[PDB]
Design an enzyme around this catalytic site. Structure first.
Site, PDB file in Angstrom:
ATOM      1  N   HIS A  78      77.256  41.730  48.928  1.00 50.13           N
ATOM      2  CA  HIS A  78      78.686  41.493  48.617  1.00 50.13           C
ATOM      3  C   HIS A  78      79.177  40.256  49.369  1.00 50.13           C
ATOM      4  O   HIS A  78      79.991  39.507  48.807  1.00 50.13           O
ATOM      5  CB  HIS A  78      79.569  42.708  48.899  1.00 50.13           C
ATOM      6  CG  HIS A  78      79.058  43.951  48.257  1.00 50.13           C
ATOM      7  ND1 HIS A  78      79.496  45.189  48.623  1.00 50.13           N
ATOM      8  CD2 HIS A  78      78.158  44.136  47.268  1.00 50.13           C
ATOM      9  CE1 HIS A  78      78.892  46.095  47.876  1.00 50.13           C
ATOM     10  NE2 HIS A  78      78.057  45.473  47.045  1.00 50.13           N
ATOM     11  N   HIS A 264      68.732  45.654  42.973  1.00 54.00           N
ATOM     12  CA  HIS A 264      68.350  44.740  44.086  1.00 54.00           C
ATOM     13  C   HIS A 264      66.856  44.444  44.032  1.00 54.00           C
ATOM     14  O   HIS A 264      66.482  43.270  44.153  1.00 54.00           O
ATOM     15  CB  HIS A 264      68.794  45.320  45.427  1.00 54.00           C
ATOM     16  CG  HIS A 264      70.250  45.608  45.462  1.00 54.00           C
ATOM     17  ND1 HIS A 264      71.195  44.615  45.256  1.00 54.00           N
ATOM     18  CD2 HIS A 264      70.926  46.752  45.690  1.00 54.00           C
ATOM     19  CE1 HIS A 264      72.397  45.150  45.333  1.00 54.00           C
ATOM     20  NE2 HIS A 264      72.260  46.462  45.624  1.00 54.00           N
TER      21      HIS A 264
HETATM   22  C1  LIG Z   1      83.127  60.331  49.249  1.00 58.33           C
HETATM   23  O1  LIG Z   1      82.017  60.625  48.396  1.00 58.33           O
HETATM   24  C2  LIG Z   1      81.083  59.661  48.155  1.00 58.33           C
HETATM   25  C3  LIG Z   1      80.057  59.912  47.252  1.00 58.33           C
HETATM   26  C4  LIG Z   1      79.084  58.957  46.987  1.00 58.33           C
HETATM   27  C5  LIG Z   1      79.143  57.722  47.618  1.00 58.33           C
HETATM   28  C6  LIG Z   1      78.141  56.662  47.398  1.00 58.33           C
HETATM   29  C7  LIG Z   1      76.818  57.053  47.280  1.00 58.33           C
HETATM   30  C8  LIG Z   1      75.834  56.100  47.099  1.00 58.33           C
HETATM   31  C9  LIG Z   1      76.227  54.772  47.034  1.00 58.33           C
HETATM   32  C10 LIG Z   1      77.526  54.352  47.158  1.00 58.33           C
HETATM   33  C11 LIG Z   1      78.516  55.310  47.344  1.00 58.33           C
HETATM   34  C12 LIG Z   1      77.564  52.919  47.047  1.00 58.33           C
HETATM   35  N1  LIG Z   1      76.290  52.483  46.879  1.00 58.33           N
HETATM   36  C13 LIG Z   1      75.792  51.126  46.677  1.00 58.33           C
HETATM   37  C14 LIG Z   1      75.747  50.918  45.160  1.00 58.33           C
HETATM   38  C15 LIG Z   1      74.832  49.800  44.673  1.00 58.33           C
HETATM   39  C16 LIG Z   1      73.483  49.965  45.344  1.00 58.33           C
HETATM   40  C17 LIG Z   1      75.447  48.466  45.112  1.00 58.33           C
HETATM   41  O2  LIG Z   1      76.618  48.175  44.893  1.00 58.33           O
HETATM   42  N2  LIG Z   1      74.717  47.651  45.744  1.00 58.33           N
HETATM   43  O3  LIG Z   1      75.326  46.436  46.126  1.00 58.33           O
HETATM   44  S1  LIG Z   1      74.661  49.870  42.993  1.00 58.33           S
HETATM   45  C18 LIG Z   1      76.181  49.922  42.340  1.00 58.33           C
HETATM   46  O4  LIG Z   1      73.974  48.698  42.522  1.00 58.33           O
HETATM   47  O5  LIG Z   1      73.967  51.073  42.587  1.00 58.33           O
HETATM   48  C19 LIG Z   1      75.528  53.595  46.858  1.00 58.33           C
HETATM   49  O6  LIG Z   1      74.236  53.580  46.710  1.00 58.33           O
HETATM   50  C20 LIG Z   1      80.219  57.463  48.573  1.00 58.33           C
HETATM   51  F1  LIG Z   1      80.229  56.270  49.177  1.00 58.33           F
HETATM   52  C21 LIG Z   1      81.179  58.436  48.815  1.00 58.33           C
HETATM   53 ZN   LIG Z   2      77.143  46.259  45.323  1.00 62.01          ZN
END
Ligand SMILES: COc1ccc(-c2ccc3c(c2)CN(CC[C@](C)(C(=O)NO)S(C)(=O)=O)C3=O)c(F)c1
Ligand SMILES: [Zn+2]
Length: 299
Positions: A78, A264
């Site tokens: 980010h 990623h």
């Molecule tokens: C309050 O409840 C929750 C439940 C789940 C999550 C949560 C659980 C897992 C993840 C994220 C949030 C964000 N995040 C990064 C997302 C991801 C890897 C990303 O943005 N990378 O830059 S993506 C969108 O490409 O899949 C996670 O892997 C949380 F933060 C809070």
């Molecule tokens: Zn992201």
């Protein structure tokens, strides 16, 4: 010429790692011409520096992670998207801990702080990586492609069997050859699922994660009181991610990126595949901004 850019002033931010939950102090500093983006663990003695370059990627699991030996810088995507979006070539990024602060889960707070501090043009040609040949990688279902394009544009498609996604599969394409980054993608927040959260917290992942810094997706709904910044916020965030992972090339891109359920891991395999194939790209500068295919915000 289109000139290299650095920070006009030092920026300080405090926050929390998404995955680690650790409290982290961030300091962004001006850097000389051709430094690129260099992360620095200032909590360690001596300080450990890691250029934001494809070759320094380690884990590409739930974030993009930079490695040098035991030492990691976690969740760079980010911040690097903000750097890439605003055309910042040279900066030192100092962290008091392993993970970049997640902020509101977008690049918004980073572009606000940077643009508040302002940018400094430097007396040196900005270098671009121009895509000359199609370059493609595939891990079964997933695809990530570079295509020649006279400018900078990013297309993405996600396709999750989950009711939140409109019923309509969310796809987006954005041309960033002019100044669309801040408006179009900067504010798109990361996202994750109530379903996965206890297991991930078991693996010491998403420990810092909350509605304060992510779109949290129940069985059927977004849980956040205030809902979505955009109808296609999910796919816009995947575009934000791709721009940051692509900046690990070390220079801005002249070309098109197309992602299909990409993340990623595949982004990083695409850079390594590109870097290996020297007939597929060259480095270009522009002695006259008026004939260049990219333009940048006033500094
Ligand atoms: C309050 O409840 C929750 C439940 C789940 C999550 C949560 C659980 C897992 C993840 C994220 C949030 C964000 N995040 C990064 C997302 C991801 C890897 C990303 O943005 N990378 O830059 S993506 C969108 O490409 O899949 C996670 O892997 C949380 F933060 C809070
Ligand atoms: Zn992201």
């Amino acid at each position: 010429m289109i000139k290299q850019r650095t920070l006009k002033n030092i920026i300080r931010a405090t926050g929390v790692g998404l995955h680690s939950g650790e409290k982290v102090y961030l300091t962004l500093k001006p850097a000389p011409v051709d430094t690129g983006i260099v992360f620095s663990r200032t909590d360690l003695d001596p300080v450990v520096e890691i250029p934001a370059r494809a070759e320094n990627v380690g884990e590409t699991t739930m974030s993009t992670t930079l490695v040098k030996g035991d030492v990691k810088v976690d969740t760079v995507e980010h911040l690097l998207s903000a750097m890439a979006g605003l055309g910042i070539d040279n900066a030192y990024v100092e962290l008091s801990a392993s993970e970049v602060p997640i902020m509101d889960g977008s690049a918004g707070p980073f572009v606000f702080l940077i643009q508040s501090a302002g940018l400094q043009e430097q007396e040196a040609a900005k270098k671009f990586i121009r895509i000359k040949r199609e370059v493609s990688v595939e891990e079964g279902d997933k695809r990530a492609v570079f295509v020649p394009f006279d400018g900078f544009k990013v297309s993405f498609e996600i396709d999750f069997d989950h009711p939140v996604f409109r019923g309509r599969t969310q796809q987006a394409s954005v041309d960033f050859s002019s100044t669309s980054f801040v408006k179009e993608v900067s504010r798109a927040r990361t996202f994750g699922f109530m379903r996965d959260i206890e297991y991930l917290r078991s693996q010491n992942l998403a420990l810092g994660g909350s509605v304060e810094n992510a779109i949290v997706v129940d069985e059927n709904r977004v849980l956040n009181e205030d809902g979505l910044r955009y109808e296609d916020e999910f796919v816009k965030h995947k575009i934000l991610d791709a721009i940051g992972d692509l900046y690990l090339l070390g220079n801005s891109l002249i070309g098109e990126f197309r992602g299909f359920k990409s993340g990623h891991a595949l982004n990083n395999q695409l850079l390594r595949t590109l870097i290996a194939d020297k007939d597929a790209w060259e480095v270009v500068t522009f002695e006259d901004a008026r004939t260049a295919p990219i333009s940048y915000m006033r500094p």
